[PDB]
Amino acid sequence: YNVVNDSSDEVFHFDMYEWYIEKGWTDRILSIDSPHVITYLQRLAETDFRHAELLCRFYTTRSRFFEAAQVQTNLAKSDLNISLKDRIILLSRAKGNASVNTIGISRQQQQQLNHEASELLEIAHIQDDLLERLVADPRIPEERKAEIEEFLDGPIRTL
Amino acid sequence: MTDLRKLEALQALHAELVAVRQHRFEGLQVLETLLEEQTDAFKALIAKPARDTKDREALGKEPKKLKIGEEEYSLNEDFVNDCLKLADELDLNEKESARILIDCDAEGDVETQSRPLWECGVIRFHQERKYLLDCMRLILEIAADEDIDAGLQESFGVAAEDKIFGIPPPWERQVKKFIPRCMEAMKGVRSMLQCMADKANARNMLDNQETLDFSRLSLVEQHECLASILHAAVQRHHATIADFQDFIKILRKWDKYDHFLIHLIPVLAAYITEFGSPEGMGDLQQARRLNDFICSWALPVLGAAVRAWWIAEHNGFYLDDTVQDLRGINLDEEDEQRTKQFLDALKEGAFDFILSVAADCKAQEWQDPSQLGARQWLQRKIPSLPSEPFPFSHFLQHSLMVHLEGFVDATISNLPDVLRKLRTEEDEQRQLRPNHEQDMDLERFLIIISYAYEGRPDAAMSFWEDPDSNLAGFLQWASRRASTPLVSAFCEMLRCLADNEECATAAHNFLLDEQSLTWSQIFKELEYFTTKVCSEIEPESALMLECYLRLIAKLATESEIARKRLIMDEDFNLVDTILKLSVGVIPHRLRACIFYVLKALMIRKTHEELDAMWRWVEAWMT
Amino acid sequence: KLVINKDMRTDLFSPPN
């Protein structure tokens, strides 16, 4: 592992960040002082959920809660393939992270994000309560249930 | 700014807490916004990720581009060398260590301090723990402030339960408790400080001397903050017996006397108060086991003091037989056992250690020359501090004085017969062998009482409000016929119990007749010594004279009735006696005390007093 | 923003196509 960390090959270190992510070694990746890994995540954060989650962990441990709430909220409003329940977790985290002070950011900007995440989380829970009840309902034909699961187990719908 | 880093976030947060503490509520809306952004910080007090090999080998393999979170940075042969150096000195992860160094380049503090880049990382790392821990003390301190709005006082209270102690609020709700994390947290500070001296001493045996001194200061401050946080948490009845046993074992395994022991003293005091005294876990059965458990020690004075405090605090149960159950238990045997244990603790030097700690706590760089040699004529056998620059705080001193006054009240209201028998034993010992110096237990105890009651008139008034209480009873009983040391200790106590004018007037009215000490005997002894010197003198007589002069000066500076009476009293004529004593062959201390007494008497005077003073001066100088 | 429109929906109790 010395030979690994003693390298200056950049495509290599990118390939190793991806490999650590694959194997699940949050142990070793979260323990890198470097910003090089943060910058690498900032480009692909809004591309994949698993990468965004890593980026948000780096922000939170650095008391940058508002920036994580921003990543999580945009991810919940996006058209990436994300389940409704995963979008409930993202909003719930963003709601908490925007409710606490982050230095350098105005109280107004925090509250406006904490409010957008609170409303979207309220709608998401309604949608989750619906989807669950509809799937379990004995009086609903199977043919329709599959159709319900397609349109409700994804991005959050209007009221 | 708005996008502040971890360091700037804690530094700004600290300023806000000081505002609310200094009666400035202009940042209420801004304060709540910070606690939510640093929620993950308050959860873990102090935790450094272990040095991993995955980052060590990867950092040096491709030191070209670094990705931390969302931003990206470029590593060069110069910066990469600082990461490995910082990680080795502090044993910190390469990823976390790199982030610290990156924060310095952005803020650009290398020019503000003109130091190597790798050294700044050590300071920046210590600053985080300082504010991260120091800010917690302000939260609990403000949550207990009674001079603020009740609503705001409760906001910081519930917040600390969840942010610091990890306890959710009442309106909601695998995890580890706070104490076990705090104990392990303080442990890391000790191991880190120990390894620091070993490595530092090796290379020393440079431009980093001041940095090492600042790091040691930050470490001791963080340890004091952790101790205060632990004390506050224990004050909320959030402990158990396992933590108490662990703390007792850690104390038994104590090696050297330093500031850490003085910081932990109040922790054990609060532990005994919550468990030993009937003001907490009032399980009488549980207290019996702890008594035998407390009653191996690498320092006997510590065990003696602990046993004395435990006995003093636990003797409050056996006062009456109506508030608790005391059936099928003998009293005389337990009383004799506690008495012999307290006597053994005294012989081992419990009060001596307490007095040495109290003295070392208020160690001041400079002292007023009007009180030189006061309370410094005993036989101190306890080793002193190494004199390193580790100044104490104010809240710690306040808590120490409060605990000492509480212990004094308990010992006075629970063990009067013990003090009586000790005084009689000392008297008979001094009588059967005057050539030898008996023990100074009572004098040391009175000096500790004086140190406890200093600059606190709210507590000193208790000795004058109720003249029929136990406090006034002991005050009047300690004024009977005794030796020079006891009289000097009582005079010093009276002098220190005159922080204001009301207490000074009360002491004046209580000293004069309305047997206990009276001004008549004082002036008689003064005239006797004057005639003896003018027709040798022992240290005890000089000490008594100096104590009398200091007491008179204090009463004249604090009280007005005494200043107006003694100045023109025909039966005393203190001025003539002090002048006849000063014109004699005596050391300079007595002359200085007489001059200070004259100054105090002449602090507020009129034309007639000025004329009389000038007449006396001319008559005695011509 | 809510807008009720009972007019044209999709029969929740009939399959598609």
Short mmCIF file of N, CA, C and O in Angstrom, two decimals, chain B residues 167-213:
data_model
loop_
_atom_site.label_atom_id
_atom_site.label_comp_id
_atom_site.label_asym_id
_atom_site.label_seq_id
_atom_site.Cartn_x
_atom_site.Cartn_y
_atom_site.Cartn_z
N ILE B 167 -28.39 12.89 23.86
CA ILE B 167 -29.67 12.47 24.41
C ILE B 167 -30.77 13.24 23.68
O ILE B 167 -30.78 14.48 23.75
N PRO B 168 -31.68 12.57 22.98
CA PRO B 168 -32.71 13.30 22.23
C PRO B 168 -33.64 14.05 23.16
O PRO B 168 -33.72 13.74 24.36
N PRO B 169 -34.36 15.05 22.66
CA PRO B 169 -35.27 15.82 23.52
C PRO B 169 -36.48 15.00 23.90
O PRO B 169 -36.69 13.89 23.38
N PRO B 170 -37.31 15.50 24.82
CA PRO B 170 -38.46 14.70 25.28
C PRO B 170 -39.51 14.46 24.21
O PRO B 170 -40.31 13.53 24.36
N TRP B 171 -39.54 15.25 23.14
CA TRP B 171 -40.56 15.14 22.11
C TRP B 171 -40.18 14.17 20.99
O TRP B 171 -40.72 14.28 19.88
N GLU B 172 -39.28 13.23 21.26
CA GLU B 172 -38.92 12.22 20.28
C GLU B 172 -38.01 11.19 20.95
O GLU B 172 -37.25 11.53 21.86
N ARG B 173 -38.11 9.95 20.49
CA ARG B 173 -37.32 8.86 21.03
C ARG B 173 -37.52 8.73 22.54
O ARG B 173 -36.99 7.82 23.17
N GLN B 174 -27.45 0.64 21.00
CA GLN B 174 -26.57 0.67 19.84
C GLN B 174 -25.57 1.82 19.95
O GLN B 174 -24.41 1.69 19.56
N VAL B 175 -26.02 2.95 20.50
CA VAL B 175 -25.18 4.12 20.66
C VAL B 175 -24.46 4.04 22.00
O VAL B 175 -24.91 3.37 22.93
N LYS B 176 -23.33 4.73 22.09
CA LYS B 176 -22.52 4.77 23.29
C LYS B 176 -22.84 6.02 24.11
O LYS B 176 -23.13 7.08 23.56
N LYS B 177 -22.78 5.88 25.43
CA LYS B 177 -23.06 6.99 26.32
C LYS B 177 -21.99 8.07 26.18
O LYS B 177 -20.97 7.90 25.50
N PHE B 178 -22.23 9.20 26.85
CA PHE B 178 -21.32 10.34 26.75
C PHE B 178 -20.08 10.13 27.61
O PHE B 178 -18.95 10.36 27.15
N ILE B 179 -20.26 9.71 28.86
CA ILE B 179 -19.16 9.52 29.80
C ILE B 179 -18.09 8.61 29.18
O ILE B 179 -16.92 9.02 29.10
N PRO B 180 -18.43 7.39 28.75
CA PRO B 180 -17.39 6.52 28.19
C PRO B 180 -16.63 7.15 27.04
O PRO B 180 -15.44 6.85 26.85
N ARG B 181 -17.27 8.02 26.25
CA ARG B 181 -16.55 8.73 25.20
C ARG B 181 -15.67 9.83 25.78
O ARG B 181 -14.55 10.05 25.32
N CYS B 182 -16.17 10.53 26.81
CA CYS B 182 -15.38 11.58 27.44
C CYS B 182 -14.16 11.00 28.14
O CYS B 182 -13.06 11.56 28.05
N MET B 183 -14.33 9.88 28.85
CA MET B 183 -13.20 9.25 29.51
C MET B 183 -12.14 8.83 28.50
O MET B 183 -10.95 9.06 28.70
N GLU B 184 -12.57 8.20 27.40
CA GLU B 184 -11.63 7.84 26.35
C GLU B 184 -11.07 9.07 25.66
O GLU B 184 -9.92 9.05 25.20
N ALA B 185 -11.85 10.15 25.57
CA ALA B 185 -11.36 11.38 24.97
C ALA B 185 -10.20 11.96 25.77
O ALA B 185 -9.13 12.24 25.22
N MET B 186 -10.40 12.14 27.08
CA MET B 186 -9.33 12.65 27.92
C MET B 186 -8.13 11.72 27.92
O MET B 186 -6.98 12.18 28.03
N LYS B 187 -8.36 10.41 27.81
CA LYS B 187 -7.25 9.46 27.77
C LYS B 187 -6.34 9.75 26.58
O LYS B 187 -5.11 9.70 26.71
N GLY B 188 -6.92 10.04 25.42
CA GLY B 188 -6.11 10.36 24.26
C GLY B 188 -5.25 11.58 24.46
O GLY B 188 -4.12 11.65 23.95
N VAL B 189 -5.75 12.57 25.20
CA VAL B 189 -4.96 13.78 25.46
C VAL B 189 -3.74 13.45 26.31
O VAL B 189 -2.66 14.02 26.12
N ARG B 190 -3.90 12.52 27.26
CA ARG B 190 -2.77 12.14 28.11
C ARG B 190 -1.73 11.35 27.32
O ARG B 190 -0.53 11.63 27.40
N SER B 191 -2.18 10.35 26.56
CA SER B 191 -1.25 9.56 25.76
C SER B 191 -0.56 10.42 24.71
O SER B 191 0.63 10.24 24.42
N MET B 192 -1.29 11.37 24.12
CA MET B 192 -0.69 12.26 23.13
C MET B 192 0.32 13.20 23.77
O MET B 192 1.36 13.50 23.18
N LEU B 193 0.02 13.68 24.99
CA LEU B 193 0.96 14.56 25.68
C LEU B 193 2.18 13.79 26.16
O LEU B 193 3.30 14.32 26.15
N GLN B 194 1.99 12.54 26.59
CA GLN B 194 3.12 11.74 27.05
C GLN B 194 4.08 11.43 25.91
O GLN B 194 5.29 11.61 26.03
N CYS B 195 3.54 10.96 24.78
CA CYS B 195 4.39 10.68 23.63
C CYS B 195 5.04 11.94 23.09
O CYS B 195 6.11 11.89 22.48
N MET B 196 4.40 13.10 23.29
CA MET B 196 4.97 14.36 22.84
C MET B 196 6.27 14.67 23.58
O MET B 196 7.28 15.01 22.97
N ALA B 197 6.25 14.54 24.91
CA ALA B 197 7.44 14.83 25.70
C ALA B 197 8.56 13.84 25.38
O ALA B 197 9.73 14.22 25.32
N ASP B 198 8.21 12.57 25.19
CA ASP B 198 9.23 11.56 24.89
C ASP B 198 9.92 11.87 23.57
O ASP B 198 11.16 11.87 23.48
N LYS B 199 9.14 12.14 22.52
CA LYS B 199 9.74 12.44 21.22
C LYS B 199 10.40 13.81 21.22
O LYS B 199 11.52 13.96 20.71
N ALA B 200 9.73 14.81 21.78
CA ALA B 200 10.30 16.16 21.82
C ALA B 200 11.60 16.18 22.61
O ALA B 200 12.59 16.78 22.18
N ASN B 201 11.61 15.53 23.78
CA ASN B 201 12.81 15.50 24.60
C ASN B 201 13.96 14.79 23.88
O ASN B 201 15.12 15.17 24.05
N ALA B 202 13.65 13.76 23.09
CA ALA B 202 14.69 13.03 22.38
C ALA B 202 15.44 13.96 21.42
O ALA B 202 16.67 14.03 21.45
N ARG B 203 14.70 14.66 20.56
CA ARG B 203 15.35 15.57 19.62
C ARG B 203 15.96 16.77 20.34
O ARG B 203 17.03 17.25 19.95
N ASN B 204 15.30 17.26 21.39
CA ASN B 204 15.82 18.41 22.12
C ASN B 204 17.08 18.04 22.89
O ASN B 204 18.02 18.84 22.99
N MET B 205 17.12 16.83 23.45
CA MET B 205 18.28 16.38 24.21
C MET B 205 19.48 16.18 23.29
O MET B 205 20.60 16.55 23.63
N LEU B 206 15.14 25.72 18.56
CA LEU B 206 14.61 25.74 17.20
C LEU B 206 13.44 26.72 17.09
O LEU B 206 13.01 27.29 18.09
N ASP B 207 12.95 26.91 15.87
CA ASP B 207 11.84 27.82 15.62
C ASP B 207 10.49 27.25 16.02
O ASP B 207 9.47 27.94 15.86
N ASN B 208 10.44 26.02 16.54
CA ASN B 208 9.20 25.38 16.93
C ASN B 208 8.98 25.38 18.44
O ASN B 208 7.99 24.80 18.90
N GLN B 209 9.87 26.00 19.21
CA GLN B 209 9.70 26.03 20.66
C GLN B 209 8.37 26.68 21.04
O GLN B 209 7.58 26.11 21.80
N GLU B 210 8.11 27.88 20.51
CA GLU B 210 6.86 28.56 20.82
C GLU B 210 5.66 27.76 20.34
O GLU B 210 4.61 27.76 20.99
N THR B 211 5.79 27.05 19.21
CA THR B 211 4.68 26.24 18.72
C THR B 211 4.41 25.07 19.67
O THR B 211 3.25 24.76 19.95
N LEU B 212 5.46 24.43 20.17
CA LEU B 212 5.27 23.35 21.14
C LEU B 212 4.65 23.88 22.43
O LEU B 212 3.78 23.23 23.02
N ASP B 213 5.07 25.06 22.88
CA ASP B 213 4.47 25.65 24.07
C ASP B 213 2.99 25.94 23.85
O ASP B 213 2.16 25.65 24.72
#
